[PDB]
Amino acid sequence: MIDLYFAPTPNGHKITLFLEEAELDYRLIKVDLGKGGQFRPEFLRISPNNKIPAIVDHSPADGGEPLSLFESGAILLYLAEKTGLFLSHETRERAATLQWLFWQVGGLGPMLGQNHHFNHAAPQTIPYAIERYQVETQRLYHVLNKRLENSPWLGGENYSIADIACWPWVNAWTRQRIDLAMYPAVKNWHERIRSRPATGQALL
Amino acid sequence: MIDLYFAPTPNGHKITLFLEEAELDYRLIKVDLGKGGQFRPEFLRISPNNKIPAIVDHSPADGGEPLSLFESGAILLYLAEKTGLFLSHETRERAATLQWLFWQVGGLGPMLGQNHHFNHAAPQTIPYAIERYQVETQRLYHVLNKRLENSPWLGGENYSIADIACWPWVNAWTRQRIDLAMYPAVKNWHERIRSRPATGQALL
Ligand SMILES: N[C@@H](CCC(=O)N[C@@H](CSSC[C@H](NC(=O)CC[C@H](N)C(=O)O)C(=O)NCC(=O)O)C(=O)NCC(=O)O)C(=O)O
Ligand SMILES: N[C@@H](CCC(=O)N[C@@H](CSSC[C@H](NC(=O)CC[C@H](N)C(=O)O)C(=O)NCC(=O)O)C(=O)NCC(=O)O)C(=O)O
């Protein structure tokens, strides 16, 4: 049993995707981010960076006490290692997978997040910053599409944690002033993953 | 032999640190970022996201053709896996290490980078954005210090790729309008890693 500390967000949805895909037992423990749930001391012990997602794995493979982890990327990696699923053990495909996973974590998510912030959250309008993060979103979707033109999935021939990590951010394209049709390979990969049974399950 | 595609930056320095620490043969292939080196087509084949660092590993453990990787985090992980060094194989320490590695890649580096951008690069002064990234830098150094108060290294008792990934960003504190003395645990960890022989070697 995995407890997932969760708010309905792209980053939270990365973990429900994986959990449904891997067929792992879990429950959702809602964290209320508008009401400062993420600063509750006993959450900060689970997740010191004050963010969701975080998990508590009640059955760690060493059979010890529960294990807490934060950071969507490290949760996906830890769960891919634990299950043997959605991350290859072959050196080249594994490396390519990890590369795009770190790419999503360092680039896609931080930059689209700044985009969501300046366009849908900031008190006052900051044209330099809106332009700066809009151009970067486009570059990021161009990088994403470039790869998906050459490979069916980001790591090679198999669906992996790299695709799982990006999908919920692409799925918020409507909030990013992105026309998904400008990136046909992204558009197809997006619909392909939308129609996977586990994604369906996570979206209920 | 590892070729490292490199510019003198925090992100580039993560890889020289590791390489010196692991005692791996490598050469530096300078990429000129002010002159658009990162858009040269044969670099973009190595590193499609148009960034350094990237490596070409000429002796991959499978004995195949050279293997290219981009993203500092995936390079460190790939090299830690390949060498068996600076990332634990014990489940809990490994997970804690990876957590802080992803934390650096998703938070520390993107946010300090935005900080360096608005304070030392942007054409015009954007007070909302300068304030936004300055507060976030402080929060990030507070998270970093909080951890280093409770553990000697970010992953547990051993120096690891989590520390290697953060160190060059902390080492640019003078560019961030950060008083390192406000974060004593960070200050000590910083000097401790400055004085390691391999860091010394990488700084020549
Ligand atoms: N690197 C972490 C990021 C986790 C994260 O961003 N969590 C958010 C909710 S996801 S929803 C997306 C999230 N935005 C936000 O959290 C909005 C509030 C924020 N402080 C702001 O002003 O931008 C974002 O932009 N993320 C960028 C990224 O994924 O790298 C959170 O718990 N926030 C609590 C808080 O901020 O107090 C991961 O992958 O787990
Ligand atoms: N996530 C990647 C980031 C790699 C990266 O940022 N590389 C930089 C040089 S490191 S030096 C630090 C880097 N800044 C820059 O590259 C400055 C130029 C930039 N386009 C801007 O306007 O901010 C930065 O802020 N990084 C944030 C982070 O680490 O997440 C690069 O090659 N830039 C070429 C280009 O931009 O065309 C990784 O970990 O490898």
Same-domain pairing of B7 and B61: yes
Determine the residue of A6, A9, A104 to mutate for testing ligand 1's pocket, defined as the one with the most ligand atoms within 8 A of the Cβ atom.
Answer: A9
Task: Name the helix (H) or strand (E) containing A153.
Answer: none
If we measure between CA atoms, which residue out of B113, B85, B88 comes closest to residue B99? B88
In sequence order, what are the residues at sequence separation of 6 or more whose Cβ sits closer than 8 angstroms to the Cβ of residue B165? Answer: B14, B72, B73, B76, B100, B101, B104, B105, B109
Q: Are strands B67-70 and B54-57 parallel, antiparallel or unpaired?
A: antiparallel
| CA B50 distance to own-chain centroid | 17
| Structural domains counted in chain A | 2
Same-domain pairing of A173 and A191: yes
CA atoms within 13 A on the CB side of B112: 27
Same-domain pairing of A142 and A47: no
Q: Do B98 and A77 touch (CB under 8 A)?
A: yes
* Residue B4: φ, ψ to 5°: -105, 115
Cβ count near B124 (within 10 Å): 5
Cβ count near B43 (within 10 Å): 20
With beta carbons under 8 A apart, name residues in chain B contacting A61. 91
How many angstroms separate the CA atoms of A28 and A54, rounded?
11
Alpha-carbon gap: A156 to the closest alpha carbon of chain B (Å): 14
In single-letter form, the type of residue at position A83 comes to: T
Paired with A29 in beta bridges are A5
Q: Do B74 and A61 touch (CB under 8 A)?
A: no
| Pair A52, A12: CB distance under 8 Å | yes
Same-domain pairing of B27 and B115: no
Paired with A54 in beta bridges are A5, A70
CA atoms within 13 A on the CB side of A134: 13
Residue for token pair 């084949």: B45
Same-domain pairing of A133 and A117: yes
Task: Classify residue A45 by burial, with Cβ atoms within 10 Å: 0-12, 13-18, 19+.
Answer: exposed
Chain A with chain B: Cβ pairs closer than 8 A: 113
Q: Do A107 and B78 touch (CB under 8 A)?
A: no
Q: Do B78 and A60 touch (CB under 8 A)?
A: no
| A110-144 as b/e: b if 16+ CB within 10 A | bbbbbbbebbeeeeeebebbbebbbebbbebbebb
Same-domain pairing of A78 and A96: no
Paired with A26 in beta bridges are A2
In single-letter form, the type of residue at position B148 comes to: L
**Euclidean distance between the first and final Cα of chain B, in Å?**
19
Same-domain pairing of B91 and B189: yes
Same-domain pairing of A54 and A112: no
Same-domain pairing of B42 and B111: no
Alpha-carbon gap: A16 to the closest alpha carbon of chain B (Å): 18
Interface test with B, best of A128, A137, A154 (most B CBs within 10 A): A128
How many angstroms separate the CA atoms of B168 and B162, rounded?
11
CATH number at residue B18: 3.40.30.10
Same-domain pairing of A95 and A166: yes
Cβ count near B90 (within 10 Å): 12
Same-domain pairing of A51 and A97: no
Same-domain pairing of A74 and A95: no
Question: What tokens does B122 get?
Answer: 């942007």
**Distances, alpha carbon B85 to alpha carbons B13, B18, B28, B36, B82, in Å:** 18, 9, 21, 34, 8
CATH number at residue A168: 1.20.1050.10
How many angstroms separate the CA atoms of A164 and A23, rounded?
14
| CA A164 distance to own-chain centroid | 6
Question: What tokens does A202 get?
Answer: 């996570």
How many angstroms separate the CA atoms of B151 and B135, rounded?
25
When CB atoms are compared, the residue of B67, B95, B143 closest to A48 is B143
User: Helix H segments across B104-183?
Assistant: 109-120, 127-150, 161-170
CA atoms within 13 A on the CB side of B89: 6
**A58-A94-A185-A200 Cα dihedral, nearest 10 degrees:** -20
Interface test with A, best of B105, B140, B146, B169 (most A CBs within 10 A): B105
Question: What tokens does B51 get?
Answer: 């960034």
A77: closest chain B residue by CA: B98
- What was the experiment behind these coordinates? X-ray
Residue for token pair 């044969």: B42
Q: Do A67 and B126 touch (CB under 8 A)?
A: no
For A162, the domain range is 87-196
* Residue B48: φ, ψ to 5°: -65, -20
- Given resolution (angstroms): 2.3
If we measure between CA atoms, which residue out of A59, A65, A166, A150 comes closest to residue A106? A166
* Residue B69: φ, ψ to 5°: -140, 145
